Design a protein around this ligand. Structure first.
Ligand SMILES: O=c1ccn([C@@H]2O[C@H](COP(=O)(O)O)[C@@H](O)[C@H]2O)c(=O)[nH]1
Ligand SMILES: [Mg+2]
Length: 247
């Protein structure tokens, strides 16, 4: 459990789960491989668990597990979306064996430079809300925020609802963006900024008319769409949207 964390940002201060100012400005943030580095190898651990699930639950050889995992991931943005639809997998049981079994407490540590950068972004007055927009389920999302010491830095969370049993609504699908817009109180896309490591997700935000979309590419792409700004480290946001950090 994480109830013994005492460092700043270790407590969630926004609500999980009525009009507002229309001129609202919102910066959306992906979480995985965004608020922490892809070199943490957390994504590798996730893929290991996911591939194990395909093998143990779908009785597939490792090579066929890779093919099916990649196929679903490519077209859906989440393998679990395909497992739900075609294999009648329960997404919450899956989630217990995958994201929720990661040894995060041994990997993620408070990220003070990230905390300070986000504080500066909140304090300029240029952005009204920092909103999390993740394909993870809420358990994992919250756990990452608390461990990284940034859980008080966001005004809300839009996560993929793994409780659904027909399909999952997730990035890069437009319905996921619509949900993020509604939940955050965002009136127009043109009042939104977005950072994500997924090229396809960035592609959707751009196509939808978001103001500025930043594609986070640490080393090599796992493709960057027309109109996106590329950085290799989230701490480079101050380099590329500098004005948002100034009063
Ligand atoms: N892949 C999945 O994608 C999610 C990460 O979502 P995001 O924060 O990058 O949008 C995690 O559930 C991971 O297992
Ligand atoms: Mg990601």
């Amino acid at each position: 459990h994480l109830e013994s964390l005492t460092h700043p940002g270790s407590k969630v201060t926004f609500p999980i789960d009525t009009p507002q100012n229309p001129n609202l400005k919102v910066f959306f943030f992906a979480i995985d491989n965004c608020l922490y580095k892809s070199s943490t190898r957390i994504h590798d651990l996730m893929q290991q668990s996911i591939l194990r699930f395909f093998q143990t639950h779908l009785k597939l050889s490792p090579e066929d597990a890779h093919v099916l995992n990649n196929s679903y991931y490519k077209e859906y943005g989440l393998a679990i979306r395909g497992l739900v639809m075609f294999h009648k997998v329960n997404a919450l049981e899956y989630n217990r064996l995958v994201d929720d079994s990661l040894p995060l407490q041994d990997i993620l540590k408070p990220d003070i430079p990230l905390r300070n950068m986000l504080l500066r972004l909140r304090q300029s007055g240029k952005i009204d809300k920092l909103w999390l927009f993740t394909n993870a389920y809420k358990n994992h999302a919250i756990r990452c925020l608390r461990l990284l010491g940034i859980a008080d830095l966001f005004d809300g969370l839009t996560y993929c609802d793994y409780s659904r049993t027909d399909t999952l609504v997730c990035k890069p699908h437009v319905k996921a963006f619509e949900k993020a817009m509604k939940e955050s109180g965002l009136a127009r896309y043109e009042n939104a900024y977005f950072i994500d490591d997924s090229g396809k997700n960035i592609e959707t935000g751009i196509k939808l008319g978001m103001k500025t979309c930043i594609h986070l590419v640490e080393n090599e792409v796992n493709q960057t769409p027309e109109g996106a700004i590329v950085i290799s480290d989230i701490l480079e946001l101050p380099h590329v949207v500098s004005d948002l950090f100034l009063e």
